[PDB]
Amino acid sequence: WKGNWKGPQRNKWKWYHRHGYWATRKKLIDFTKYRRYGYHERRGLGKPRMQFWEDPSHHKRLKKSIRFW
Amino acid sequence: NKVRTDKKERKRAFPQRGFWKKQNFLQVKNNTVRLAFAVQGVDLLKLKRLRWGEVRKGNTGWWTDDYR
Amino acid sequence: RGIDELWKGSYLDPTIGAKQKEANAVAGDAWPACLLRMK
Amino acid sequence: AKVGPSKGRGPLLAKFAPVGFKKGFGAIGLGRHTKKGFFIINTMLVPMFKVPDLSNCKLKCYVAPDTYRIVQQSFNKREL
Amino acid sequence: WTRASGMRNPVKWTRDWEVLNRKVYFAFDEREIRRSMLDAVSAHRKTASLFHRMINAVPGVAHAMSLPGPHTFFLPSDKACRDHLSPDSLHALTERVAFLEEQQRQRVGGGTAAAIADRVAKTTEQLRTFVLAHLIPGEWRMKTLLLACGAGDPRRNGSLRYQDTDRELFAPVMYASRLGSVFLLPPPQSTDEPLPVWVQASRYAAFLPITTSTNFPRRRSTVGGALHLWVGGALVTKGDLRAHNGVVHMIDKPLIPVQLLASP
Amino acid sequence: IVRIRKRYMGQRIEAGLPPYVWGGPWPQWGRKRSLFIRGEMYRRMLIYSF
Amino acid sequence: TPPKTPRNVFFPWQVFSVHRTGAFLERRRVALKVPVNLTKFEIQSYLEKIYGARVLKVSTLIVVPRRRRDIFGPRPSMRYYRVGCTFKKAIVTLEDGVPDAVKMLRSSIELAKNPDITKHNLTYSGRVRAFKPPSAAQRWEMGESKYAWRLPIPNLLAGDEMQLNPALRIDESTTQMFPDFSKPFFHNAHFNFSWKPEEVPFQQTVKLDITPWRR
Amino acid sequence: DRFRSAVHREMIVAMTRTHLQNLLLKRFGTFKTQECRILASPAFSAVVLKAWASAVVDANLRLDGEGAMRLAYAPPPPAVLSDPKVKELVASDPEAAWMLKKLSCQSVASFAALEEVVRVKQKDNVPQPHFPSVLKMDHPQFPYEPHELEKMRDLYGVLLKWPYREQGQVASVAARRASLESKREERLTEVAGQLKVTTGCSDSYVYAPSEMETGLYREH
Amino acid sequence: GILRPRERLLLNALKKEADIRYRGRRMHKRFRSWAQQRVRHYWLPQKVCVTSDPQLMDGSYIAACVQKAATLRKHDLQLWHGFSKRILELADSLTPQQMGYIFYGYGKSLFRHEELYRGLLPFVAEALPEFHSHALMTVAWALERVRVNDRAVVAQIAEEALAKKDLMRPADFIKIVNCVARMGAAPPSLAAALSAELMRVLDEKCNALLFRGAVDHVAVATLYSDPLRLYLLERFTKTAICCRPMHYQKAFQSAVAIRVLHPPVWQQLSKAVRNFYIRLSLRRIPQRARRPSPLHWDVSNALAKLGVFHRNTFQWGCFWIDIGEIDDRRQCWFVDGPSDFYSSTNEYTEANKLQHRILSELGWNIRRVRWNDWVQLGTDMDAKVEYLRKLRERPPWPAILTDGPSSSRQEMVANLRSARDVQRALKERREKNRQPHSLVMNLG
RNA sequence: UGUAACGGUACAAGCUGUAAACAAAGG
RNA sequence: UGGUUCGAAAAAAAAAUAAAAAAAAAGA
RNA sequence: AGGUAUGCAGUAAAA
RNA sequence: AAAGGAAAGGUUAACCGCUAUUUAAACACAAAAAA
């Protein structure tokens, strides 16, 4: 190389502003692909069916659709 | 690092003849600790050197055994 | 004056012995809702 | 990856970011930034803890073990 | 990326002391000023009201003082004029400045009218002479004037370098054991007599050893500093009011020319 | 020679002898007037604070 | 994350617990684990109203447990984890002292970990050189005048309980003998101030000759 | 009269005692001497020096500054010698008796002059500084003259254990000395140094402004 | 872009000098806090216009206007005399809250209109049973600040605070006790009762920030009982860290007063507390700039013409001395102005008497000059020199400072006007004497 | 809806929301 | 001592953050 | 030659 | 000569803006309407 060697930089500002959560949202990519640390639309099954021996008074299924005061 | 994400294990795949011991720096640190303990009346070095089950009060030892 | 209450009588208290610590540690039942409803 | 939440790093914090990053933890606001880098505090916004007079209170954290027997008998005498 | 500033400035300045000394030279001696001498006078108009009014009311004076030639202007204060000029002279000066301003305002808006032109000409010439008696060719800064008067010369600065006092009379609790050269500046533009300049030790110089480490060998004005610079019998109160085309020095007495002075 | 001189001076310090030094000609090992330049800087800082 | 504190509480849920530190803490100081979202005013009011403690100062730090990799045991899963929880460490300075046996850790297994003994003579981190700002007495405003011991009022108050002469506090095993002022000697030995006593004779000021070739 | 209240007299006596203790400590070396230790001891100050200060105030000999070492060299007053508390301390404390006997023996009677002060100073036997011949000597100064470099290289193992030699036997230092002397020409008993006494007793000192608001920098 | 090398160098040097200027500028800002507190829970939620016609104002409106003007520093003589006229018209219809806010405004602005306080005090006394903590505190505070002394009403206010002890705010009670001590209005029984209540208030209800306000040397010397003194001196050692220079100064003065006048209490203290105060005596407690007044300067000028060396406005121990002679250091003078006494009277203030007694017992020979007598001399210098000489030829003043003859508000106003005229004349003929007036121009 | 961050819980691929596994016996 | 905050100057947005929770009758 | 300590608007001049 | 900073803030001036405004902190002090 010439003089002092320069390679790919580790820059938190650049990485977070170019490849972060919101930047990935603004990108044009396949959003049906699962991303561990970012936005994706591989949807889950939700809370599973109650087993016959559990207490229905404690079994829970909904959070937002029933949110009262 | 402690999480073992670095590549520092790459060099350890090759032999080396020896390694620096940093004894000057480590002895300065150890003597600083010893002084901190000694200003309060504690002989940390004596405690560290005591044999298992050995009791030595004050600044005593084999020489005390010899002359007593 | 009052901050001592965070450790007084507990196993962190340095001014009391092991038997006193155990005696202080013994505890009864939690308040039942039936009795709580009467207050 | 070498930057971001990967490898157990989790969400970003001011400790792990360069100076200039602004992220708190959920504290309430207690004043206003001025136009010259100051912060005027208003004590009217300090939450007021409501604590009753605990002196001379016969209640305690737990209940004596005999209370169960006493209440059970007192209720069985009514039920029967 | 960083937002550190102030004492955490991310700029990697040089630590070389010689380079920093050169930087001092560039930052103080070779600094560039945009404003002009009349800009400075206007900035201090409230304290130099009479001279500001004269500069703005006497034809030609502003043109003379706005020229590129590096100049030094010694500005008296209204307080100086009031203290040193006789009441009649001050009244005459105020009346004539007001007269010129009134004629200017008339412009904005027999023999008796003819005499007005003669009076205007006379007043303009006299006030122009007075004002230009303080304008001096060249740029003479305060440190240059001091070094010309000899302060800073080890052979001549005696009586200005080792001032001391009877310490026990002023800081007794610390002294229990004691409890028991005229330079000449070019003449004003309106005259031919060169201006004398000298230096003296201020009353505050003697008290330095009481509160500073010293290495000595074996009424009075209240102006600050250790050295006082006198110009033509007038004390400099505020110096180095630098401009683009000169420098203004504030003085405590007006330098009236001999022609305008009254012999008897 | 530096080691020997340092040993001797430290020995005097430990003994508690008066803080005397060799007085002879000290050679000049540097070129810069750092002392006076820094003093001028400090003067300017003090004036700014005032 | 934690619920924001309402203007009126009536039922505080915040847990203030004593934290045993491996570092040193002063006499009138104590370290507490506290929820991260609480302010110093909230902490002080909480302690003064629920316990009646007379709090003088609150200092706060945010503690995030370090990342850890599971690498050791048989069949290890190389996954990342944190031990404990993120919390606010509140160091409270009160009007009265707090027992060292309460506030700090001790050990007879690792004999070096005795902060109550070692005090501030050690740094309990990777810090090598300790930084301490100047003390209040060393400051100028509200600081100790170095000639006040000679004044009448301090001597009237001293009585027979105190002796104000600083010459009496000189450590014999550290100070050196007085030198002759007319002969070469160090300034640091016995002066301990930033000025030159007049009793030291006139000193020579040497200015570097930067251009010998010119002369 | 001369006093407005008991607290007035107490303040003046405390100031006088502090001044006397300072003077005696400086007379005996200000530290490193058993005499200084004894003068520092709380009992000696409480009894002996307190009585001495009261006697001085009674005698109206309140001197301040360097002119007060007369008091330090004067013998202890007979009132101090005859005070019963002083006698009890003398009996109970060997150091107090030793110190008081030394003060009685080594004193200037007239102060109750310079020749007598010199005699008493010699008797005191306060240790004196002494500039060492080692620090008067010289050792080679880098850069070395080629002959010096060459000789030291050849005799490394012998000449570099103690390179100190008397002035003039080191060419490197001699040349620099001669050059400095030439530039100078072109241009044209050992006693420990002490800071002068800053304490006092007189009204002029006691009732002087404290000057703590004024910004005095030379604190001492 | 690029710069020509000269321009590069000049601007680079400017940048370096700016950095160094910033560093030098921030050097002395040890007590500059970026986080700052502002008190606003006393501001009323109603809106008012201060210049509205007074005849349309009621108690609720005029009180709010007065307080708002005091907060905004709108110190206009015409506005505040209109306030006084309207308030005196509405005296019959003011609640304790409104009267408290009015007194706050007047005291905070230091508007020394004695007639308004005199006319409002009887209604305060009549309505005392309905007063609350803030109103009582404010009335006492304003009276103390403006030097309007009414011992009977102040004692009644203190008694009302005692009766409402369970409702009083701790800070208000502390301020009331301090004001009572400074005005000298509590006989021994009331002093004992106030001390007994203050002990419990401080021990149970006050943290360090509230307690530090109780440290007042006048109250310690003249009001507090011995157990209260001991408790206060012991507690200050614990609460020092949160204190400011004013608190340190008052603690030091309290310790000196106890040592000089109550040696038994000083000894009843413990060795650790005594050590704390001994070490406090060694500190540089930041004072604030003091300068001779016009009357002080006139007295100094007359003394210098008489021929007595002296120094002015200096600090000895924990006291400020007006004049301290040089030849005989024990001789000192105090120049007493209108604010050193209570309004319309020649009775000295408690602080002045305490300072006089302490300095006298510590040894100073004090002499005092009264402005009421000085003003009658006029601009004459021979008369003033003779006055000072005759005072010098007489013995010093006793350790107990006695009050002067009786006076009235009429005479006080007349003397204040005369002092104004004398000040004007002296300044005029000083500056005229300074002016040379010797340059004569032949311009005409 | 779905998912996740922190927090609590056997410091967890489970459960769970500062009431963080349980109220079922109230004018 | 810095960030924050005003300016440069920016939705040119650092997911789990704020002077940032429905925004004055606030009960002094 | 960024902003310094009652704070929001707001015009001019400038080491 | 290759022709180089002015936004916000501080200073001075001007000012019929405003609690979007300096403690219900304190020290000092011959000091002030109308009549």
Write down the residue that tokens 């010309």 correspond to.
Answer: E148
Residues 6+ apart with CB under 8 A from H56: H16, H20, H62, H71, H77, H201
Task: Measure the CA–CA gap between G175 and H32, rounded to whole angstroms.
Answer: 9
- Whether the Cβ atoms of residue F21 and residue F5 lie closer than 8 Å to each other: no
- DSSP three-state, residue I343: coil
Are the beta carbons of A12 and D3 separated by less than 8 Å? yes
Residues H104, H106, H107, H113: what is their CA dihedral angle, to the nearest 10 degrees?
Answer: 160
Mutation target to probe the E interface, by most E beta carbons within 10 A, among D19, D22, D23, D36 is D19
Tokens of C39: 């207050």
Task: Measure the CA–CA gap between E147 and E142, rounded to whole angstroms.
Answer: 9
- The Cβ-side half-sphere exposure at G104, using a 13 Å CA radius, reads 21
- Candidates B4, B36, B42; nearest CB to G71: B4
Residue D20 contacts E, CB cutoff 8 Å: yes
Distance from CA(I44) to C1'(K5), angstroms, rounded: 29
Distance from CA(D48) to C1'(K19), angstroms, rounded: 20
Residue H212 contacts I, CB cutoff 8 Å: yes
Task: Measure the CA–CA gap between I226 and I195, rounded to whole angstroms.
Answer: 9
Protein-proximal positions, strand L, CB < 7 A:
1-9, 13-15
Segment (H or E) for H16:
helix H6-27
Segment (H or E) for I332:
strand I331-336
G142-145, long-range: CB < 8 A, 24+ apart? G142/I245, G142/I248, G142/I283, G142/I284, G142/I285, G142/I286, G143/I283, G143/I284, G144/I279, G144/I282, G144/I283, G144/I284, G145/H212, G145/H219, G145/I282, G145/I283, G145/I284
Residue closest to I323 by CA, chosen among I336, I311, I306: I311
Scanning residues 1 through 60 of protein chain A, those with a beta carbon under 7 Å from any atom of strand K turn out to be 12-13, 16-17, 20-23, 37-39
How large is the C-alpha radius of gyration of chain E? Answer: 24
Residues 6+ apart with CB under 8 A from G64: D13, D15, G82, G86
With contacts defined as CB-CB under 8 Å, which chain D residues touch E3?
A: 18-20
Residue E177 contacts G, CB cutoff 8 Å: no
Write down the residue that tokens 């005091």 correspond to.
Answer: I70
Residue I399 contacts H, CB cutoff 8 Å: yes
- Candidates H11, H207, H212; nearest CB to I284: H212
Task: Measure the CA–CA gap between I224 and I247, rounded to whole angstroms.
Answer: 17
Scanning residues 17 through 76 of protein chain D, those with a beta carbon under 7 Å from any atom of strand K turn out to be 17-29, 31-37, 39
Interchain touch G–A (≥3 Cβ pairs closer than 8 Å) = no
Segment (H or E) for H152:
helix H146-154
Q: D17: burial class by Cβ within 10 Å (0-12, 13-18, 19+)?
A: middle
E202-206, long-range: CB < 8 A, 24+ apart? E202/E226, E202/E227, E202/E228, E205/E160, E205/E163, E206/E163, E206/E164, E206/E165
Strands D39-41 and I35-37: parallel
Nucleotide nearest to G82 (CA to C1'): J11
- Whether the Cβ atoms of residue E123 and residue E99 lie closer than 8 Å to each other: yes
Kindly determine whether the C-beta of residue D9 is less than 7 Å away from any atom of nucleic acid strand K: no
- Candidates G164, G167, G180; nearest CB to H129: G180
How large is the C-alpha radius of gyration of chain D? Answer: 27
Q: DSSP character for E141?
A: -
Write down the residue that tokens 């009424």 correspond to.
Answer: E219
Residue C1 contacts G, CB cutoff 8 Å: yes
Tokens of B26: 């480590």
Task: Measure the CA–CA gap between D10 and D13, rounded to whole angstroms.
Answer: 9
For residue E117, what are the CA distances in angstroms to D24, E91, E223, I150?
A: 79, 22, 44, 74
- Whether the Cβ atoms of residue E246 and residue E71 lie closer than 8 Å to each other: yes
Segment (H or E) for I196:
helix I188-205
How large is the C-alpha radius of gyration of chain H? Answer: 27
- Cα H146 from chain centre: 48
Residue closest to I210 by CA, chosen among I183, I235, I185: I235
Segment (H or E) for I370:
strand I365-370
- Whether the Cβ atoms of residue I369 and residue I299 lie closer than 8 Å to each other: yes
- Whether the Cβ atoms of residue H52 and residue H76 lie closer than 8 Å to each other: yes
What backbone torsions phi and psi does residue I33 show, to the nearest 5 degrees? -105, 125
Q: How far apart are the first and last CA of chain E?
A: 78
Kindly provide the resolution of this structure in angstroms, with one decimal: 2.2
Q: G16: burial class by Cβ within 10 Å (0-12, 13-18, 19+)?
A: buried
What backbone torsions phi and psi does residue E247 show, to the nearest 5 degrees? -145, 145
Kindly determine whether the C-beta of residue A12 is less than 7 Å away from any atom of nucleic acid strand J: no
Largest CA distance in chain H: 86
Task: Measure the CA–CA gap between I173 and I175, rounded to whole angstroms.
Answer: 5
Tokens of E102: 């009134």
Segment (H or E) for E228:
strand E227-231
Beta bridge partners of I365: I331
With contacts defined as CB-CB under 8 Å, which chain F residues touch H140?
A: 1
Gaps in chain E (C to N distance exceeding 2.5 A) after: 109, 180, 218
Q: DSSP character for G60?
A: E
Task: Measure the CA–CA gap between E137 and E134, rounded to whole angstroms.
Answer: 10
E38: how many CB neighbours lie within 10 A of its CB? 19
Protein-proximal positions, strand K, CB < 7 A:
1-6, 12-21, 24-26, 28
Q: DSSP character for H113?
A: -
Residues 6+ apart with CB under 8 A from B18: none
- DSSP three-state, residue E244: coil
Helices E49-57, E111-132: crossing angle, 10 deg rounding: 120
E59: how many CB neighbours lie within 10 A of its CB? 12
Q: Which residues of I169-189 are buried (b: 16+ CB within 10 A; e: fewer)?
A: bbbbbbbbbbbbbbbbbbeee
Tokens of G30: 């104590």
Residue closest to I81 by CA, chosen among I118, I115, I49, I124: I115
Q: E103: burial class by Cβ within 10 Å (0-12, 13-18, 19+)?
A: middle
Q: E173: burial class by Cβ within 10 Å (0-12, 13-18, 19+)?
A: buried
With contacts defined as CB-CB under 8 Å, which chain B residues touch G69?
A: 2-5
Chains in contact with F, counting 3 or more C-beta pairs less than 8 Å apart as contact: E, G, H, I
Interchain touch A–D (≥3 Cβ pairs closer than 8 Å) = yes
Cα angle I249, I352, I220 (rounded to 5 degrees) comes to 50
Residues 6+ apart with CB under 8 A from H187: none
With contacts defined as CB-CB under 8 Å, which chain E residues touch I13?
A: 22-27, 30
Task: Measure the CA–CA gap between F41 and E157, rounded to whole angstroms.
Answer: 24
- Whether the Cβ atoms of residue F29 and residue G191 lie closer than 8 Å to each other: no
Tokens of E103: 């004629």
Interface of G with I (CB under 8 A): 48, 54-57, 93, 95-96, 137, 139-145, 148-149, 151-154, 156-159, 161-162, 164
Q: DSSP character for I140?
A: H
Strands D31-33 and D39-41: antiparallel
For residue I292, what are the CA distances in angstroms to A41, A65, I321, I418?
A: 81, 78, 11, 20
E23: how many CB neighbours lie within 10 A of its CB? 22
Task: Measure the CA–CA gap between I223 and I216, rounded to whole angstroms.
Answer: 10
Nucleotide nearest to E142 (CA to C1'): L15
- DSSP three-state, residue G208: coil
Closest chain G residue by Cα to residue E216:
G202
Q: Does the CA dihedral G120-G125-G128-G133 come out positive or negative?
A: negative
Distance from CA(H30) to C1'(J23), angstroms, rounded: 83
Residue closest to G102 by CA, chosen among C5, B49, I23, E6: C5
What backbone torsions phi and psi does residue I175 show, to the nearest 5 degrees? -65, -40
Task: Measure the CA–CA gap between I182 and I145, rounded to whole angstroms.
Answer: 10
Kindly determine whether the C-beta of residue E62 is less than 7 Å away from any atom of nucleic acid strand L: no
Residues 6+ apart with CB under 8 A from I83: I54, I62, I65, I66, I69
Distance from CA(D15) to C1'(J19), angstroms, rounded: 33
Task: Measure the CA–CA gap between H211 and E173, rounded to whole angstroms.
Answer: 8
Interchain touch B–E (≥3 Cβ pairs closer than 8 Å) = no
- DSSP three-state, residue D67: helix
User: Could you tell me the strand order of the sheet in which I310-316 lies?
Assistant: I310-316, I319-325, I331-336, I365-370
User: Could you tell me the strand order of the sheet in which G87-94 lies?
Assistant: G17-18, G29-34, G87-94, G55-63
With contacts defined as CB-CB under 8 Å, which chain H residues touch G182?
A: 193
Are the beta carbons of G196 and E218 separated by less than 8 Å? no
Q: Does the CA dihedral I391-I393-I399-I402 come out positive or negative?
A: negative
- Whether the Cβ atoms of residue I319 and residue I309 lie closer than 8 Å to each other: no
Task: Measure the CA–CA gap between G165 and H195, rounded to whole angstroms.
Answer: 15
Residue E215 contacts G, CB cutoff 8 Å: yes
Distance from CA(C16) to C1'(J7), angstroms, rounded: 34
Cα angle B46, B47, B49 (rounded to 5 degrees) comes to 65
Which 20-49 residues of chain D touch chain G by CB within 8 A?
A: 25-28, 30, 43, 45-49
